């Protein structure tokens, strides 16, 4: 039955499978089960990547090497292929003939074992008819008798929902739980496997590189398991060297190479930031200030927090930064957050919390639980952060949302992870969480009933404490209150708005020049402390956009031409002069 | 397994089955045939074919008594003893039935007890190369049952014994204050290994309620690391809705998510000995508490599939923030009042009286004292030092500087978390600029001192 | 798409689990990357190791067609895998890779293409490129933890406005020929 | 005119005007005539129905795992079908 089964020992001697390091207790338990008089069938149930197939195939490698008990010295393991058995079983009884013949051969030798990988498949082996007859039923009598020994390997999910369903088959197979190895165990495993990977890639792995891969993988790569996770980084690093230049770093791969590979797999900013990134970070605050005038403290907090994470002083299991922006309307809480993403070139995960007003809406962020119509949709927040781990999470109008949503963000701020309905765990370590709240807006604009109008800035903080539970506030890195928009700052805003108009105007071929006198007139006409900088847009729209639009649609400005705006002190009104540049 | 013969043929044209070939003969009664089937298969497969079920006479078979099972092992003792060349003591066979049924629940009594005998003989036969020990002692039976059931309960090892003794001391080094909480966890865990543990309840069911910033979660998280066991951390904010509770015990059969199974039961099955940290239990729906009531007393929870998860070795620690607003509430009057009693009343309102009775102990975490905060500041500096070591930088903080940091950030209501924020602004922010662009880019050195005249810290960086 | 392609070559040259997976939103260009490699291979721009390798595309419908008889599906799937192993320089491209999880199998039977292909992917004998959307990758492909471990995810982020204009300029000769028109430079931008 | 001319906000709707006036003053009718003059769809929405907070879910639809999730949101679906239209919200104060 060479077509259906392959001898692991023969493969081990000439080619080899993998050197097995450790797992002494797991092998001893498996060997003890095989030596049992009855029901001597070990089942290596474990999580994916733990090494369920290494222990089963390692036994053959150990047997040829001779580091096994005397009873197992003559034992031979065969790897069954379910596909090969069903390759040509079109006719009735063909599969039974092949399967029965295979089991019969094992009984005659009485000194061999069968390794069925992904054993969950044989519960539903080829059965043309509806009858329960299948490989599991065929092998069930032999297992109880003890004539043959068959090793098994299946995941917890498959074993619990497929293998367990068959109570008779489960009884014969003695479950052996495989547990993920420790950090120390994994580094030793890589050292034993290092020669095999070094030869294929023609590289030499430094001791620091192997240790860093295991430690870095656990910290950033969470979905996979540690033994598989470390080998992936080590294997990928070797591949890069083969594809690197002819003689730059072929001889050895340093820790820096390992750090870069981990960053690409997890989509996290690489360690040892480049000079280009340093220039962007150094000028991040300066550039942000140009777009958003004033509110330097808010910009400093965001930039300083981002600088700490890249520097290597970031929180162990918390996001880069949690900031609650509270202030009067028009200050620029949303604008600074939006500009931060553009400056850093990272995706902006904008979530309008007004939509999630009711408690039931909380399911949208984490997905509906299993057994409901919304299971397939998943969680908007979890899916978004998974797609874009490095991003700015802008939860605008957070106060509008129900307090239930605040509870969901407790683990995000402290644990640094959120769990989806499907069970997937999101990573919030590299996301910048910014929450804009308009709490106390009514109080701050309100004028107190007294001879002296008390500043209501303090009052706003009281509503924040009432709206948000104390645990939520403690997890936050800081609450940055936007004080107000000064008159001098408003003058700059007029220039910024005119610049926005100029780019829009450039598309139509019209160039606008505004005199300094006209700019000052706009600021005084529309300056409102309570409304912030939003009225500036309205005065500019009515004063400048409305005349230009009429001329642009019908008039001299149909074809792009320069326009001049000047202030007449006698009339205290803007003077618009249009000059056609067509000819 | 007579259920199989009902089918066995569906090929085109023949339209024949084994049951149909033998159906006339059975109806005639000339031939008599014995059969065996599982209860589920008989109701679902054999019962469907009324003709076969009508003819066959059902004979119920059920697990025998404890006394009857040990007798069976004695009867089967010559066979197993001959193969392994071992001899089992009378006490050993009795221990296997009692120990296996106590810890192994999925399997029925006959095979479950015999599985220990067969494995015990193999272990005794295989363990010594010299074959010095042929007989199977009662102690060996206990060890075999432990591995099969994955229970830590066994004779305490010298290596494991030492760690247990210093569990409280090590926890105190990481978590300062809250000695009552550490004592409760350490004493309960010690009892389980000693054997003075609840027969069908978890080793510990502790509810941790305290002010914000106190180390409730940290002690639970650090306990897992000190004991070298997995941490089954289940955030309970996600389970606010009633329908979400099914996720913990699995969706009912026939739905899209039935296959994935329960998240709590599967995790407990994968890690029998682990710390189950149910943080923010207050936020969870009342239905969640109902499930836990069964776990605390019965000791097992059945999922949609029907498998039972063993919580006997699981350390159940549920952190709660109930009555935390009262803790930070400032009472009217010249002198602030202790609102600890008010917080307990809120916990009593949220948690049913029956729930509290089941809990082993309710530990009210006290506010961090000034002395405790000084230790907290040092702990955070150690974490910063470790991060700096990765970049090749060494940080030395003077004693005067540490006291200054403690006073600036010490708030009784807020807790230890403000200390981290102070360290971030005062220490991490300057280092970050130097690390990215400055003397600390490579192989830096740092010194920190408090300017007594200016009452401001001084940061000295050496390129080195 | 040099950075995206460069990572794919690194994954393909791995000793084990050398199966790159292209996960991105619809319209990003995952198929272009999988097929673009073949186009670059003919030109020779790809590295020397990639040179002389043939990339094939698997039609799931064709493989499952006329497989009612027991074992017909396994015969076709095991025949193709044998071909890839024998060549040693062929890379399979399975578009909409989530489909193999639900390939030809009986109602009770759990044997699928994913289970059959799982042993070969781990050993590294065959290289299999993949392409699937984020929704399908998480709701279907990731559920099969065993299969996901063998496949290495390669995140694809849609190109910027500046990057997109050059893509149109490179694809402009084909669209112009089909529509017999010329696109102005300003029109493309 | 400003939006069509290319001098629009580029991130906000064409206009957000609150017409507050006495009954029978023409606030509702001017909007209806605007749609006819422009030949665009009129997304009439009576806000008197949304007297309480729970009714707001209808505008954006029910979340996953709750009844009526398949139905979707009337306001979101209406705007999607007719991008260029006049979104009238009568009796906004009563909402």
């Amino acid at each position: 039955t060479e077509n259906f089964t392959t001898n692991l020992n023969q493969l081990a001697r000439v080619g080899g499978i993998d050197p097995l390091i450790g797992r002494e207790k797991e092998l001893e338990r498996a060997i003890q089960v095989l030596c049992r008089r009855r029901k001597n069938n070990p089942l290596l149930v474990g999580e994916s990547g733990v090494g369920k197939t290494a222990i089963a195939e390692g036994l053959a490698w150990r047997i040829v090497q001779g580091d096994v008990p005397e009873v197992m010295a003559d034992c031979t393991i065969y790897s069954l292929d379910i596909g090969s058995l069903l390759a040509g079983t079109k006719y009735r009884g063909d599969f039974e003939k092949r399967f029965k013949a295979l089991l019969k051969q094992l009984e005659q030798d009485t000194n061999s074992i069968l390794f069925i990988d992904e054993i969950h498949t044989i519960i539903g082996a080829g059965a043309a008819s509806g009858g329960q007859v299948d490989a599991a039923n065929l092998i069930k009598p032999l297992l109880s008798s003890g004539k043959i020994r068959v090793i098994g390997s299946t995941t917890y999910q498959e074993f619990s929902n497929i293998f367990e369903k068959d109570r008779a088959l489960a009884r014969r197979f003695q479950k052996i739980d495989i547990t993920e190895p420790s950090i120390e165990e994994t580094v030793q495993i890589i050292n034993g496997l290092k020669p095999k990977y070094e030869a294929h890639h023609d590289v030499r792995y430094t001791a620091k590189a192997v240790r860093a891969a295991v430690e870095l993988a656990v910290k950033y790569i969470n979905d996979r398991h540690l033994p598989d996770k470390a080998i992936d980084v080590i294997d990928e690093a070797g591949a890069r060297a083969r594809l690197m230049p002819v003689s730059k770093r072929k001889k050895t791969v340093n820790v820096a190479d390992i750090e870069s590979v981990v960053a690409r797999i997890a989509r996290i900013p690489e360690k040892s930031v480049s000079q280009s990134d340093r220039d962007t970070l150094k000028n991040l605050g300066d550039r942000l200030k140009m777009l958003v005038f004033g509110q330097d403290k808010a910009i400093e907090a965001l930039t300083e927090a981002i600088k700490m994470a890249r520097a290597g002083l970031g929180h162990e299991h918390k996001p880069v930064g949690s900031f609650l922006f509270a202030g009067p309307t028009g200050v620029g809480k949303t604008e600074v957050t939006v500009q931060l993403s553009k400056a850093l070139g990272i995706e902006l995960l904008r979530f309008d919390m007004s939509e999630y007003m009711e408690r039931h809406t909380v399911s949208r962020l984490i997905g509906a639980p299993p057994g409901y119509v919304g299971f397939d949709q998943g969680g908007l927040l979890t899916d978004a952060v998974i797609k874009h781990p490095h991003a700015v999470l802008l939860l605008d109008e957070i106060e509008k949302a129900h307090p239930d949503v605040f509870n969901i963000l407790l683990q995000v701020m402290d644990n640094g992870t959120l769990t989806d309905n499907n069970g997937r765990k999101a990573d919030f370590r590299n996301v910048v969480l910014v929450m804009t709240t308009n709490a106390g807006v009514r109080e701050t604009e309100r004028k107190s009933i007294g001879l002296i109008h008390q500043d209501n800035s303090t009052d706003a903080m009281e509503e924040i404490k009432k709206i948000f539970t104390p645990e939520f506030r403690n997890r936050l890195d800081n609450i940055i209150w936007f004080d107000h928009l000064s008159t001098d700052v408003i003058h700059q805003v007029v220039d910024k708005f005119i610049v926005e108009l100029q780019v829009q105007l450039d598309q139509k071929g019209v160039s606008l020049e505004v005199s300094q006198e006209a700019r000052n007139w706009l600021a005084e006409k529309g300056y409102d402390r309570a409304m912030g900088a939003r009225p500036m847009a309205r005065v500019i729209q009515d004063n400048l956009k409305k005349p230009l639009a009429n001329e642009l649609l019908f008039g001299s400005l149909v074809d792009g031409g320069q326009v001049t705006v000047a202030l007449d002190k006698e009339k205290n009104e803007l003077t618009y002069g249009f000059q056609s540049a067509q000819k | 397994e007579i259920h199989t013969i009902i089918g066995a043929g569906a090929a085109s044209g023949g339209q024949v089955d084994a049951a149909n070939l033998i159906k006339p003969l059975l109806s005639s009664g000339k031939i008599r045939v014995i059969g065996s089937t599982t209860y589920q298969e008989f109701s679902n497969i054999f019962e469907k074919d009324r003709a076969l079920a009508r003819r066959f006479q059902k004979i119920d078979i059920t697990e025998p008594s404890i006394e009857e099972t040990v007798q069976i092992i004695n009867g089967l003792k010559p066979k197993y003893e001959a193969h392994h060349d071992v001899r089992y003591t009378a006490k050993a066979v009795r221990a296997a039935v009692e120990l296996a049924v106590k810890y192994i629940n999925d399997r029925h009594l006959p095979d479950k007890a015999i599985d220990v005998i067969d494995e015990a003989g193999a272990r005794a036969r295989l363990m010594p190369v010299s074959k010095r020990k042929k007989t199977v002692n009662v102690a060996d039976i206990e060890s075999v049952v432990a591995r099969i059931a994955r229970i830590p309960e066994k004779s305490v090892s010298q290596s494991d014994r030492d760690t247990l003794k210093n569990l409280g001391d090590r926890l105190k080094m990481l978590v300062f204050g809250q000695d009552k909480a550490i004592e409760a966890l350490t004493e309960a865990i010690k009892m389980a290994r000693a054997g003075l543990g609840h027969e069908h309840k978890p080793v510990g069911s502790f509810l941790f309620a305290g002010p914000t910033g106190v180390g409730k979660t940290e002690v639970t998280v650090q306990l897992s690391k000190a004991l070298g066991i997995e941490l089954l951390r289940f955030d309970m904010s996600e389970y606010m809705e009633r329908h979400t509770v099914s996720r913990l015990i699995g969706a009912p059969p026939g739905y899209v998510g039935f296959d994935q199974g329960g998240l709590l039961t599967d995790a407990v099955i994968k890690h029998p000995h682990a710390v189950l940290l149910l943080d923010e239990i207050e936020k969870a729906h009342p239905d969640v508490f109902n499930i836990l009531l069964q776990v605390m007393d019965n000791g097992t929870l059945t999922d949609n599939n029907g498998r039972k998860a063993d919580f006997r070795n699981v350390v159940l620690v549920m952190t709660t923030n109930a009555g935390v607003r009262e803790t930070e509430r400032k009472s009217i009057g010249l002198i602030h009042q202790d609102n600890s009693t008010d917080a307990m009343e809120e916990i009593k309102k949220i948690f049913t009286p029956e729930f509290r009775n089941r809990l082993d102990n309710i530990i009210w975490f006290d506010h961090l004292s000034t002395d405790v905060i000084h230790q907290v500041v040092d702990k955070f500096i150690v974490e910063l030092q470790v991060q700096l070591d990765q970049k090749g930088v060494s940080l030395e903080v003077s004693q005067e500087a540490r006291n200054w940091l403690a006073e600036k950030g010490y708030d009784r209501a807020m807790g230890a978390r403000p200390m981290a924020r102070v360290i971030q602004d005062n220490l991490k922010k300057p280092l970050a600029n130097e690390l990215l662009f400055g003397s600390l880019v490579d192989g830096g050195q740092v010194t920190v001192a408090l300017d007594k005249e200016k009452n401001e810290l001084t940061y000295g960086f050496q390129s080195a | 798409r040099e950075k995206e392609l460069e990572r794919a070559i690194q994954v393909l040259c791995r000793r084990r689990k050398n199966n790159p997976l292209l996960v991105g939103e619809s319209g990003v260009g995952k198929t272009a990357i999988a097929e673009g490699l073949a186009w670059r291979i003919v030109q020779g721009d790809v590295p020397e190791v990639m040179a002389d390798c043939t990339i094939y595309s698997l039609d799931i419908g064709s493989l499952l067609a006329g497989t009612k008889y027991r074992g017909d599906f396994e015969k076709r799937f095991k025949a193709l895998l044998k071909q890839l192993e024998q060549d040693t320089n062929s890379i399979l491209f399975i578009d909409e890779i989530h489909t193999i999880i639900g390939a030809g199998a009986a109602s009770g039977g759990q044997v699928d293409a994913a289970n059959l292909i799982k042993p070969l992917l781990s050993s590294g004998k065959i290289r299999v490129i993949g392409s699937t959307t984020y929704q399908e990758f998480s709701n279907i492909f990731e559920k099969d933890r065993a299969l996901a471990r063998r496949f290495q995810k390669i995140d694809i982020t849609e190109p910027s406005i500046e990057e997109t204009v050059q893509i149109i300029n490179g694809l402009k000769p084909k669209y112009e020929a089909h529509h017999d028109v010329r696109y102005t430079a300003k029109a493309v931008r | 005119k400003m939006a069509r001319a290319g001098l629009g906000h580029e991130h906000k709707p064409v206009g957000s005007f609150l017409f507050a006036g006495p009954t029978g003053v023409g606030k509702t009718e001017v909007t209806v005539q605007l749609s006819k003059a422009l030949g665009i769809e009129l997304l009439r929405f009576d806000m008197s129905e949304y007297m309480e907070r729970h009714t707001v879910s209808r505008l954006i639809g029910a979340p996953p795992g709750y009844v009526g999730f398949d139905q979707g949101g009337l306001l979101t679906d209406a705007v999607i079908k007719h991008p260029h239209a006049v979104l009238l919200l009568d009796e906004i104060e009563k909402a």
Binding site: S129, G130 | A11, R242, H243 | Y69 | G65, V67
Partner: peptide, 18 residues
């Protein structure tokens, strides 16, 4: 008062005539 809304092919064998 919210409400939650909860929400054939087999291979065959052929026998040739004897």
């Amino acid at each position: 008062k919210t409400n939650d809304w909860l929400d054939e092919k087999v291979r065959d064998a052929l026998k040739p005539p004897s």
